[PDB]
Design a binder for these strands. Structure first.
Ligand SMILES: [Ca+2]
Ligand SMILES: [Mg+2]
Ligand SMILES: [Mg+2]
Length: 429
DNA sequence: ATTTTGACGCT
DNA sequence: AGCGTCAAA
């Protein structure tokens, strides 16, 4: 009752760019705008692998991971943009730079946590308090929320936009605007701010995005996906029981893999809401102390993970796969590709040092051997003392050379299906 | 023969 | 330290 926390103490948003790499390419090439199109890496093998897909193309069934040749069977007029290739490998610089554009705009509004190349969490609690003081009891107009959905509404006693407006009207007609401590009002002001933030992103970059607004990161992330693209969704604390009552467990962030499968298998449930019937101790007994407490609160819509103040990635990495017959089988091959990776890494590190006043101090080398299901077969670290590609490639070879079983120095066995260099452990400079 | 990333947890 | 999990385009 009066002491039961309800996880309504924060306003958190998650902003996620729509079909991000596709929008980057469509901004650059107006011929691709408003078309079924996809972004592909490599072209020789089955037309290249698709990594991003416009919503027009998704209507034909085109998805990520599809070979372009196969996507063309579903969508013969599909347009394609290719990821840049440099030093023999795909190079994602254009998308990293577009990401910086968006992150820098979002940072003007509030502290953000960079969650991926195209998404960030936003802690809006303080901004909401400020805006509520500015508003001075003034009601919030639907015109301030032109792309907002209120999850769960409309309810009670045939076009999409019509439903959106009906739900928003019910919500705003039911708000108590004089209570500055009302969580629902705080979320609503949050959504007003997010409309402003999304408008700024689109104005200043050309890119559209979706967003979720709720009381914590997990619900904000879930909310964001409910009405893509180019829309935002408010998930209130009160919407949680109905929302979770038919929500597959795997849809909640962190439960899409083995742990989620085990929750389903061990407990014999399917939906997030069903978790409420277990005690905290029961959940801890199956999934561990940390996961158990997290599940117990999360299934009630409560999560405390903070929006971390971090706009920049903590690692800078470069990797290449060598699938099937292309696996690296000679020492020379391994050294040449380590050099290519190290040269890209050097370029990115030097730019990072100039832009962000920091230097990486550890180099992580990872390889995969043909026949291993795991992404990485072996990982070794060494000191990163100079931004020099020849030194980094030599040091990586030094730390992995003993993995070569082959009695012949010139041959590498078992062949390598992957090389990965990652700069970590940044210090101020 | 998706590939190329990035964060964080465990021991 | 080195390995595993989960998530992005
Ligand atoms: Ca996205
Ligand atoms: Mg994303
Ligand atoms: Mg996606």
């Amino acid at each position: 009752g009066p002491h039961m926390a309800t996880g309504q103490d924060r306003v958190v948003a998650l902003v996620d760019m729509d079909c991000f790499f596709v929008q980057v390419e469509q901004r650059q090439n107006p011929h691709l705008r408003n078309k079924p199109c996809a972004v592909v890496q490599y072209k020789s093998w089955k037309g290249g692998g698709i990594i991003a897909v416009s919503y027009e193309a998704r209507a034909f069934g085109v998805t990520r991971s599809m070979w372009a040749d196969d996507a063309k069977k579903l969508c013969p007029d599909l347009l394609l943009a290719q990821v840049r290739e440099s030093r023999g490998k795909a190079n994602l610089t254009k998308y990293r730079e577009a990401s910086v554009e968006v992150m820098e705009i979002m940072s003007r509004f509030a502290v953000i946590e960079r969650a991926a190349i195209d998404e960030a969490y936003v802690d809006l609690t303080s901004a909401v308090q400020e805006r509520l003081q500015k508003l001075q009891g003034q009601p919030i107009s639907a015109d301030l929320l032109p792309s907002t959905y209120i999850e769960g509404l409309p309810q009670g006693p045939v076009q999409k936009e019509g439903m959106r407006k009906q739900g928003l009207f019910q919500w705003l007609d039911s708000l108590q605007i004089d209570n500055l401590t009302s969580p629902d009002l705080q979320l609503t002001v949050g959504a007003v701010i997010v409309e402003e933030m999304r408008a700024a992103i689109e104005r200043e970059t050309g890119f559209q995005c979706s967003a979720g607004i709720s009381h914590n990161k997990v619900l904000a992330k879930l909310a964001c996906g409910l009405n893509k693209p180019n829309r935002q969704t408010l998930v209130s604390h009160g919407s949680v029981p109905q929302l979770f009552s038919q929500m597959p467990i795997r849809k909640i962030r962190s439960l899409g893999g083995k742990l989620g499968a085990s929750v389903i298998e061990i407990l014999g449930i399917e939906y997030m809401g069903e978790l409420t019937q277990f005690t905290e101790s029961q959940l801890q007994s199956h999934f561990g102390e940390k996961n158990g407490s997290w599940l117990y609160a999360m299934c009630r819509g409560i999560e405390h993970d903070p929006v971390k103040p971090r706009q920049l990635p903590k690692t800078i990495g470069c990797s290449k796969n060598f699938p099937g017959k292309t696996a690296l089988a000679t020492r020379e091959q391994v050294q040449w590709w380590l050099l290519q990776l190290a040269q890209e890494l050097e370029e990115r590190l030097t730019k990072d040092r100039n832009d962000n006043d920091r230097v990486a101090t550890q180099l992580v080398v990872s390889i995969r051997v043909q026949g291993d299901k795991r992404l990485s077969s072996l990982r070794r670290c060494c000191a990163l003392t100079r931004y020099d590609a020849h030194k980094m490639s030599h040091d990586a070879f030094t730390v992995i050379k003993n993995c070569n079983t082959s009695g012949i120095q010139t041959e590498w066995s078992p062949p390598l299906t992957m090389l990965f260099l990652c700069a970590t452990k940044f210090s101020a400079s």
